[PDB]
């Protein structure tokens, strides 16, 4: 929460792009949440995460809809929409309409640097309990 790596800050505050493989999230499939590193506040789930070969956690839409502010992007001689902490308004990198065709056909690629995971069986424990999906 701003004590972060120069990469956690770099991305989430700087708006910078982890490297591809070398990322925590990206092969991760654990069940359980994952959050705003800064906020907290929870951005997505497990169950809604999939293999893109892309280099970064992949998914196929966002926990709460209401809950990420998604930006035109002209960076890099590009248009583009990035996504971003509504909450902690902190960088999660872009999205894509090239997702799996048969869950929302988005791929909402997110740099690991701007979250961190929390495991489903310690979750009524640090207080997102209310987020038992499944």
């Not at 701003?2 to 700087?14: A, F, G, K, N």
């Not at 998914?59 to 583009?80: N, W």
């Not at 999660?92 to 988005?106: A, M, R, T, Y």
């Not at 995971?117 to 309990?129: A, N, Q, R, T, W």
Request: glycine share 8%; proline share 4%; charged share 30%.
């Amino acid at each position: 929460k701003s004590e972060l790596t120069d990469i956690e800050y770099i991305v989430t505050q700087e708006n910078g792009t982890e490297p591809p493989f070398m990322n925590e999230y990206w092969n991760h499939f654990a069940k359980g949440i994952y959050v705003d590193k800064i906020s907290g506040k929870p951005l997505f789930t497990s169950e809604e995460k999939f293999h893109s070969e892309c280099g970064w956690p992949s998914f196929s839409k966002a926990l709460d809809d209401d809950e990420i502010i998604e930006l035109v992007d002209k960076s890099f001689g590009m248009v583009r929409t990035e996504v971003r902490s509504e909450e902690s308004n902190s960088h999660l990198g872009h999205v894509f309409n090239d997702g799996p065709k048969e869950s929302g056909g988005l791929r909402y690629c997110i740099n690991s640097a701007a979250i961190q995971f929390i495991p489903y069986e310690k979750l009524e424990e640090l207080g997102y309990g209310d987020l038992i999906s499944h």
